[PDB]
Structure formats: structure tokens, C-alpha cells
């Protein structure tokens, strides 16, 4: 037989000639019946032809084909929290995907491959059925029933052969404490075989430090409890005996640092063997040789375990590299900010021997940078010299955009709103933009704030802040305390060290007031102003163009730009007045941020946030009441309304405010509340002492897609604001705050939420100790 025409009955990925070429008998080649069967298998060797029926019209071949190709979709059903793409990936481990050859044989290969995966999920009561659903002209949907019944659970690890400790104290020193003996309380358990893999060396490292160099885990028998749930394990171990580290005999290339390498391995001979200390002491040598330039130091300890006295003998084999490994360095991930911004954030320079932590401190400086999401590098050895490593600092930059909002219910009332947005160095410009402002009837506030933090080479933080508060506090007119405040604030930072950086600035505080509030602490500073404005009336205006000089300095040794976990930061900032001011005063403050990790996983770190402030006149004046300090609200003592903690002024017995809202906006005025009302809100202390005691807390029930910058954060908030300029005959039958014995107290949790608009903090705090004129807002809403 010799074929004159091959009949092609449906191929759909293999071409007409490409099928024909896979036929060992081509059109014109002679047909053998063995070639026909060879046409069957070799078109079965197409990997796309489900069935191949090679016949012939005498010789003229009739190759009737069924087709495997494109699986046009794959459907999952019963695809529970074990994700269907992972169920697709064991299906991809079955060689199956969308747009693929469907051999309809690998159905159970998907299934039993997933059922074996379902075993290694953590379940065993979990099955799966794959369903073929045909789509146009060869195509198929792969529907997939997943019959997942229930999961397995680790119940109790029976560690037999334990002759040094007890099993339960190991389980305590794997994870556990007690459960209500009128003492501490613990949690729950589930199965995974890698937790089994982890605790067995937590078993061994519990042996490796207490002696026990011939501790060995002999065997392990997981109980197949016949339920597919009960995971008990019968583990055979053997402590061998206690062992001692009885001597260090370090040898090899100690690179001329032999005493130092011996000093890291200064041990007690006969001390119970701590193999965990030994490998540490190897790493002590490695960073020693690393900081000595030897980027690749071999250090090989060897405990010659002397069972005859139940000791070990530490041979160490050390071998360092060469010094000048940091030949040059590279910088990647600087597509948005330049190299020299990231390049100046380093302590490791090229043309040097390796300081092993100079790479790391600069990476910690890059961790202290804040224009990042990741800090990484590629410290790659350029081959060709033992003085040759490229450190390719590849990092991921900032996630930008942040918003803050307040509402005055505009366009359903008077057009009233609070704005505010932060650009977080938009596009890595080295221009951090955060701009806010608000327009109500009460105020029409304007503000500007941006800086190039490095605008000149010495770290010129080119920050000019602007403000124009067209603030009136309008009830109907300029009757209750207008203040049109306007001007600028240009401030500059300069690094005095690598973790110490100074600050200095100037303020132009031009205020335009009218009909000020008919009260003591308002007029008392204005009595210190050289004015004597009307006690019983809001008819009193004020124009101050204050020329003020600002200053400060910061400490910065604390980890991360957007989720730190360890270290300390001090942030000095204050102000003072100069000639040309319309008032002579100072105002000094400081902020601190010190992180003490109780958990060494740093899921629980002490975060102490406290605020201090003091200010008075420079002689013959006061610090203004509008610069007197406050607390409450979103402050370090939250659970309050805003401006609750502080001194409480007294309205003079007042008449119309040049317009009194009738039995509204009460200032001891003519309509209501008259005859020496007391200003119940915190009008301000010229001194301040407040604190907030926060903690890192992990979120063990939250999808950690975003928890890298999400910090649930408990607190116990407490403090005072008090005026050292406070009167006490003016405030005789009124709140006196001349002393900081006004220690408020609240407690609760802060909920920092990483949005694409930045971290969003929210609080609930119940104030359980308060002082005069405090107000309480437990449902505390912050940004």
C-alpha cells in the first residue's frame, strides 16, 4: 500500500503536515499495516492526539484523530482555603494547565496527586475529583470537585528514650507554659509535619547546650490514629550522656588575629557542653575576620567529644580570606531616587578593606532612610581576586500617598470641610510633600509644607513651611475670637554626626484678631502683653507679628522608616523670640522614641511615647496662651476629646461679644452662663508632662499581606498639662494648674492600619483617672 491522500480528522494544534510528518508513512511513502500502527503511536507521540484511528482507503490513508489540545479553562469546586491555584499547581504537577494538551488519563493524577498533596496539606480527610467538560471543537474545561472532609491535628508528642529531661519540659521549652493553675494560660494546637521537623532540633538544641554531644534522636513513630486526625508521635531519642566543653584547640589560618580568635573561644574546660555557643563562637570569628576585611572566613569548630570523661574537645579550623574584598559597590533599585542619595546612605566605601557591618550600618541607615519598602543588597564576589566583591545594594523604594480627613458636613450645611494629603516623597524626588488646610465659616486655613531633605550636599533639608489661617470662629460675625494668622516657617536640618543631626529655623507669626474671649488666661497673657483688654466684653483686638527663632536636633538609632522594632531616638525641637517680634518669649520641647524589645522576635517591643514642653516670656512678657501646651484627643493621653488635659480659664462676667449668640457660645455672656463662668476646655499650660506607653503586638489572626506595617498597639496613657504662669486667685474657686500633680490616666489599644494612604491609626481608650475639665472620647478616631 502507498498513500495517495492522508485523511486528517481534527488536529487543532499539530499542523496538517506536522501530523503527516509524525506519521512515519507520509503521503507518497508506502503504507504498511505496521506503519499504520506506527502511525497510531507516533501520532500518540504528538502529545496532542487523544485517539488516532489510522485507516486507509485501500492505501489512501484515513487517519481519524481525537484531540488533546487547548484546555480552554479549568474549574475548581470545593476549592476551600487551600487555594485553587495551589490545587492548580498540583494539577500543574500533573502536567495540566489552561490551553493545554488534555490527555484524559491524568484526571486521577490530578486527584491522587492532590490527595497526596491533601495529605501534606495538614489534612488527610480530603479528596478531589477532576471533571472534563468539553469546550469548542476539541477544547475542554477541567471542572474539579474537591471533597475535603476534615484536617489532621497534632495531639501529643510521645518522646521515648528521653533519659535527661522530661518530654513536657521540652514541650514547654519548645512553646508552652501552664494553663490556669491560678497561674499562666496558653493556647491551642494543629498538625504540620514541619513543626515536627522544627521542634526536634529545638529538642536537640535543648540538649546541645546542656551537655549532650552524644544526644541523638533515635527514631520516630507517628501514631496513625485511625481517624485521619489524631497525630501522636512515638519519638525514640537518646541523651547519650551529659557532655562538657573541655577545651578549645583552635587552629588553621587565624589570619594574625589568633589571641582575638582565642578570645572569642575563651571557654571553661569542663563546662557542660554548649554546642550552640560553639557555633556562635565560630560566627564570632567570622565577623571578626569579616570586619578585618576577610569577607569569606572559613571557621570550622570540631568538638572532639571525649566520652571517657563525658566531655568534648573543641578543635577549631579557621581560615580567613583577604582584606580588600570591598573593591567597589553597586546600587540598584534607584530608578526613582538617584544613586548618590542611596550611595551617601552607607558606611562601607570602595577602595577599602571590608568593614563587615559598614555594609550593614549603611543598610541600617537605609533602614533608617524611610524612602523604602525593602532594604537589601547583593554582596557579590567579583571573581578574580580575594580583594574583589561587588556589593550591589538593590532595594525597593517608597510606597507614596497618604491622606487625612475631617468633615464639617459641607454642601448639606455651610460649605465646611477639612482637607489634607501627604505625598511621601512622590516619585522618589527627594521632595516629601504633605499639605493640609480647611475652609469653614470659623476658619479658612492655608498651609504649605515641602522639603528637599538634601537640597545642598551637606544635607540641606530645604523646608519652608507656610500658613495663612483666615480664622474667625464665626458664629455670625467677628464676635467670638477672630484670629487671622499668617506667615511662614523656614527651617533647616544639618547632620552633626551619622546618627546626630541638628535643626534651626525662623517663624513669622503675623496674627490679626478682634473681639477676643472675655476671660482671664486670655487677658492675663494680654496683661503680660502690656495690654489691659476688656474683661467683661469681647471687643478686644490683637495684632501680633511675632518674629520667632526655632531650633532643634535629633538622635537617630532606631530601625525602620515605617515599622521599627529596636533602638532609640531623641528629637529636640524648640523656639525663642528675636528683636522685631511683637512679643518676647520662648517655647522649648523634645520628642523621644526608644524601642526595647521584650520579645526577641520583636513582636512585643516597648514603645515609650512621651511629650514634654515648657515656655515663658523672655522677660516682661509671657509665652502666649495660644502657645501654651495641651493634651487629650489624639494626643499621648487619648480616650479624650481634644484639649482636655490642662489648665481651665475663667470667663469674666460678660455681656454681648459685640454680638452674642442668644444662649449659645457661652463665655459668661449676656445671654446665659453669666457672672464668672469658667472656661472648661483646656486653655493651655505653659508646661507639659504627658506620656503614652505603647507596644508592638502581632496580629496572629490577620492575613499578613499588609501586616508588615500594621501594628496593633496597646497602651496605658497618662500625664498632665499645667501652667506655671497660672494664677490662683483668678482661679481661686476654679481649676488651678500651677502644679504637675494633675496626672490623668487612660488605657487601651491603638490600631495602626497600613493603607495605600499610609498608616491609619485608630484608638479606644477608657480614661480611668482624670482631672479638672477633662472630657472623654473612648471611640477615638485618628489618622
Amino acid at each position: 500500500f502507498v498513500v495517495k491522500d492522508i485523511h486528517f480528522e481534527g488536529l487543532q494544534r499539530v499542523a496538517v503536515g506536522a501530523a503527516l510528518l509524525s506519521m512515519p508513512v507520509r503521503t507518497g511513502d508506502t503504507v504498511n499495516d505496521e506503519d499504520i500502527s506506527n502511525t497510531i503511536r507516533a501520532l500518540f507521540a504528538t502529545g496532542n492526539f487523544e485517539d488516532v484511528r489510522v485507516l486507509r482507503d485501500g492505501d489512501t490513508l484515513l487517519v481519524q484523530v481525537k484531540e488533546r489540545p487547548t484546555i480552554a479553562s479549568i474549574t475548581f469546586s470545593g476549592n476551600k482555603s487551600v487555594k485553587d491555584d495551589m490545587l492548580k499547581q498540583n494539577l500543574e504537577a500533573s502536567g495540566v494547565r489552561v490551553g493545554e494538551s488534555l490527555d484524559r488519563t491524568t484526571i486521577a493524577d490530578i486527584e491522587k496527586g492532590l490527595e497526596d498533596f491533601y495529605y501534606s496539606v495538614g489534612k488527610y480527610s480530603a479528596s478531589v475529583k477532576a471533571v472534563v467538560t468539553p469546550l469548542p471543537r476539541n477544547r475542554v474545561d477541567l471542572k474539579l470537585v474537591f471533597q475535603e472532609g476534615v484536617s489532621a491535628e497534632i495531639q501529643q508528642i510521645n518522646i521515648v528514650g528521653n533519659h535527661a529531661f522530661t518530654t513536657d519540659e521540652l514541650i514547654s521549652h519548645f512553646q508552652l507554659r501552664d494553663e490556669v493553675p491560678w497561674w499562666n494560660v496558653v493556647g491551642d494546637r494543629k498538625y504540620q509535619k514541619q513543626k515536627l521537623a522544627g521542634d526536634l532540633e529545638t529538642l536537640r538544641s535543648y540538649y546541645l547546650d546542656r551537655g549532650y554531644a552524644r544526644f541523638n534522636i533515635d527514631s520516630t513513630q507517628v501514631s496513625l490514629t485511625p481517624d485521619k486526625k489524631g497525630i501522636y508521635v512515638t519519638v525514640n531519642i537518646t541523651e547519650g550522656d551529659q557532655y562538657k566543653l573541655s577545651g578549645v584547640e583552635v587552629s588553621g589560618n587565624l589570619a594574625g588575629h589568633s589571641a582575638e580568635i582565642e578570645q572569642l573561644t575563651k571557654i571553661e574546660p569542663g563546662e557542660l557542653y554548649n554546642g550552640t555557643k560553639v557555633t556562635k563562637m565560630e560566627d564570632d570569628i567570622k565577623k571578626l575576620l569579616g570586619r578585618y576585611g576577610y569577607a569569606y572566613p572559613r571557621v570550622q569548630s570540631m568538638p572532639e567529644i571525649n566520652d571517657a570523661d563525658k566531655t568534648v574537645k573543641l578543635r577549631v579550623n579557621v581560615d580567613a580570606g583577604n582584606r580588600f574584598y570591598v573593591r567597589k559597590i553597586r546600587f540598584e533599585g534607584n530608578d526613582t531616587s538617584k544613586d548618590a542619595v542611596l550611595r551617601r546612605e552607607m558606611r562601607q566605601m570602595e577602595g577599602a578593606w571590608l568593614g563587615s557591618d559598614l555594609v550593614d550600618q549603611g543598610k541600617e541607615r537605609l533602614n533608617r532612610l524611610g524612602f523604602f519598602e525593602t532594604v537589601d543588597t547583593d554582596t557579590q564576589r567579583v571573581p578574580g581576586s580575594p580583594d574583589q566583591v561587588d556589593v550591589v545594594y538593590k532595594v525597593k523604594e517608597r510606597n507614596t500617598g497618604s491622606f487625612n480627613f475631617g468633615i464639617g458636613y459641607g454642601t448639606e450645611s455651610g460649605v465646611s470641610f477639612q482637607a489634607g494629603v501627604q505625598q511621601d516623597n512622590w516619585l522618589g524626588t527627594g521632595y516629601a510633600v504633605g499639605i493640609n488646610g480647611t475652609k469653614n465659616d470659623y476658619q479658612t486655613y492655608a498651609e504649605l509644607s515641602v522639603t528637599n531633605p538634601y537640597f545642598t550636599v551637606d544635607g540641606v533639608s530645604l523646608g519652608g513651611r507656610l500658613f495663612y489661617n483666615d480664622f474667625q470662629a464665626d458664629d455670625a460675625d467677628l464676635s467670638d475670637y477672630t484670629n487671622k494668622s499668617y506667615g511662614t516657617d523656614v527651617t533647616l536640618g544639618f547632620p552633626i554626626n551619622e546618627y546626630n543631626s541638628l535643626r534651626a529655623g525662623l517663624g513669622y507669626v503675623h496674627n490679626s484678631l478682634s473681639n477676643m474671649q472675655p476671660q482671664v488666661a486670655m487677658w492675663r497673657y494680654l496683661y503680660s502683653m502690656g495690654e489691659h483688654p476688656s474683661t467683661s466684653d469681647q471687643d478686644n483686638s490683637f495684632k501680633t507679628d511675632d518674629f520667632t527663632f526655632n531650633y532643634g536636633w535629633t538622635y537617630n538609632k532606631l530601625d525602620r522608616g515605617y515599622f521599627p522594632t529596636d533602638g532609640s531616638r531623641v528629637n529636640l525641637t524648640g523656639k525663642v523670640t528675636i528683636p522685631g517680634s511683637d512679643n518676647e518669649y520662648y517655647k522649648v520641647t523634645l520628642d523621644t522614641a526608644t524601642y526595647v524589645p521584650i520579645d526577641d522576635d520583636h513582636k512585643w517591643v516597648v514603645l515609650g511615647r512621651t511629650r514634654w514642653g515648657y515656655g515663658d516670656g523672655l522677660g516682661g512678657k509671657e509665652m502666649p496662651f495660644y502657645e501654651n501646651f495641651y493634651a487629650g484627643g489624639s494626643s499621648t493621653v487619648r480616650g479624650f476629646q481634644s484639649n482636655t488635659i490642662g489648665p481651665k480659664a475663667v470667663y469674666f462676667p460678660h455681656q454681648a461679644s459685640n454680638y452674642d449668640p442668644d444662649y449659645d457660645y457661652e463665655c459668661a455672656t449676656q445671654d446665659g452662663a453669666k457672672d464668672l463662668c469658667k472656661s472648661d476646655d483646656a486653655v493651655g499650660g505653659n508646661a507639659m508632662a504627658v506620656a503614652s506607653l505603647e507596644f508592638i503586638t502581632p496580629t496572629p489572626f490577620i492575613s499578613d499581606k499588609y501586616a508588615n506595617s500594621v501594628r496593633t498597639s496597646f497602651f496605658w496613657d497618662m500625664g498632665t498639662v499645667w501652667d506655671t504662669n497660672w494664677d490662683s486667685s483668678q482661679y481661686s474657686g476654679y481649676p488651678d494648674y500651677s502644679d504637675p500633680s494633675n496626672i490623668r490616666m487612660s488605657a487601651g489599644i491603638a490600631l495602626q492600619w497600613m493603607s495605600p494612604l499610609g498608616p491609619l491609626v485608630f484608638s479606644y481608650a477608657q480614661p480611668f483617672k482624670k482631672y479638672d475639665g477633662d472630657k472623654a472620647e473612648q471611640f477615638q478616631f485618628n489618622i
Binding site: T70, T336, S337, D339, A340, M349, G351, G428
Partner: protein
């Protein structure tokens, strides 16, 4: 968006929504073209259109993925010069594309990561197709791109001139001269190395660079 029609109807609606410019819909035709029906006679032109329509949807690495698809689908094609352009043309827009330019913020002191890769492809054009319609603009890419790749590592060579790492000046300045001793930045990094030896009491080696300035800056 993705149709399950016959592919030439999908290809008819493909070349519509390309010339309609419906790249949200044009790609979904061209994807339904070559993925559902991987036997298109236009599946080179579809994958030509895919590099096009991905880039026409500004899907730069997906144009590059359709490039590598077209590298895999048609490594025998007269429009790999297209690919070698659209490779770098991705890697032009893959490298620096921020909105920060109107306000006077540089992006060439920023990394030339894919501008290195664009220089590769626009050289791989003018190597692999030194004749094509795409080869002239790629030659127009390269001599311009070497100067963009000048100003990054010049800002590195100036950085060790800032650092006082004067060995690392010379390792960067000659590192520029090992990279591009034809850009104006290399003539002007040349005094930094001339400074660098001079600060390291290698004034004689520095005055060697002064005679190098006497030649190479000319």
C-alpha cells in the same frame, strides 16, 4: 473581553480594536487568538500585534513577554528588528518613566537599569539587524543612551569625589572610561581622578591625569 468565537472573527475584531485602539479589547482578541486557537496564520502578526498592542496598552514587560513569545514563536521573522527595537523600547520605558520631569527632577542620575537593557537591545538591533528600518533609530538610541548612561555613573564618580574615596573616584572615573571614554561626562570626571591622586599625594599620578585632561578633554 476575551471572545470564544472562531479566531478569524476574533482576528477581524482584533485588527479592528487595534485600529480602533481598544487595547483593553484588542489584546483580549489577540490573546484569544493565539492562546485558545494556537494555529492562527496571523499568529506571528498577532504576536507582532501583541508586542504592539501590549505596548499600545503600555504593557511594557508584557510586550517584552510577547517579544519573548515572538522570540519563541518566530525567531525566523523579518520583524525581530521590530522585536529588537520594541525590546529596548520597552527597556526605554521600563527604566525611567516617572511624572517628575515637568518640575525639574532628574531621572538619569536615577538608575539606567533597563537603559542598560535598552542599550543592549538597541545594540542587538544594530547588531542583529544593522540594516532595518528599526536600526537607524536604535543607532539614534545608542549614542544618545550612552550619554544617559554617562550621567548616572558620572554621579557615582562624583559621589566618591564627595566621599573622599579617591581610589573609588579613579575606580569610577576610569570605570567610566572603561565604560564610555567618549562622553562629555568622562572628560569631566577626568579632573576628579586628577583631583583624586592629588589628594592622595599622587600629584605626579594626578599630573599624569592632567596630561590626560590635556588630551582626553580635547
Amino acid at each position: 473581553e476575551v471572545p470564544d468565537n472562531p479566531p478569524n472573527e476574533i482576528y477581524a475584531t482584533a485588527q479592528q480594536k487595534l485600529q480602533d485602539g481598544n487595547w483593553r479589547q484588542a489584546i483580549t482578541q489577540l490573546e484569544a487568538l493565539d492562546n485558545r486557537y494556537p494555529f492562527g496564520p496571523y499568529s506571528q502578526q498577532v504576536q507582532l500585534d501583541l508586542i504592539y498592542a501590549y505596548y499600545k496598552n503600555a504593557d511594557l514587560p508584557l510586550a517584552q513577554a510577547a517579544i519573548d513569545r515572538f522570540i519563541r514563536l518566530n525567531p525566523t521573522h523579518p520583524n525581530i528588528d521590530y522585536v529588537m527595537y520594541m525590546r529596548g523600547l520597552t527597556n526605554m520605558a521600563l527604566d525611567d518613566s516617572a511624572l517628575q520631569g515637568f518640575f525639574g527632577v532628574d531621572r538619569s542620575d536615577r538608575d539606567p537599569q533597563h537603559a542598560r537593557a535598552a542599550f543592549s537591545d538597541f545594540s542587538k538591533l544594530v547588531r542583529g539587524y544593522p540594516n532595518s528600518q528599526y536600526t537607524t533609530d536604535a543607532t539614534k538610541r545608542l549614542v544618545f543612551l550612552k550619554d544617559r548612561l554617562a550621567k548616572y555613573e558620572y554621579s557615582v564618580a562624583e559621589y566618591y569625589t564627595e566621599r573622599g574615596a579617591w581610589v573609588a573616584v579613579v575606580n569610577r572615573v576610569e570605570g567610566m572610561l572603561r565604560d564610555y571614554p567618549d562622553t562629555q561626562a568622562t572628560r569631566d570626571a577626568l579632573p576628579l581622578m586628577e583631583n583624586a591622586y592629588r589628594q592622595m599625594q599622587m600629584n605626579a599620578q594626578a599630573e599624569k591625569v592632567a596630561k590626560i585632561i590635556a588630551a582626553n578633554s580635547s
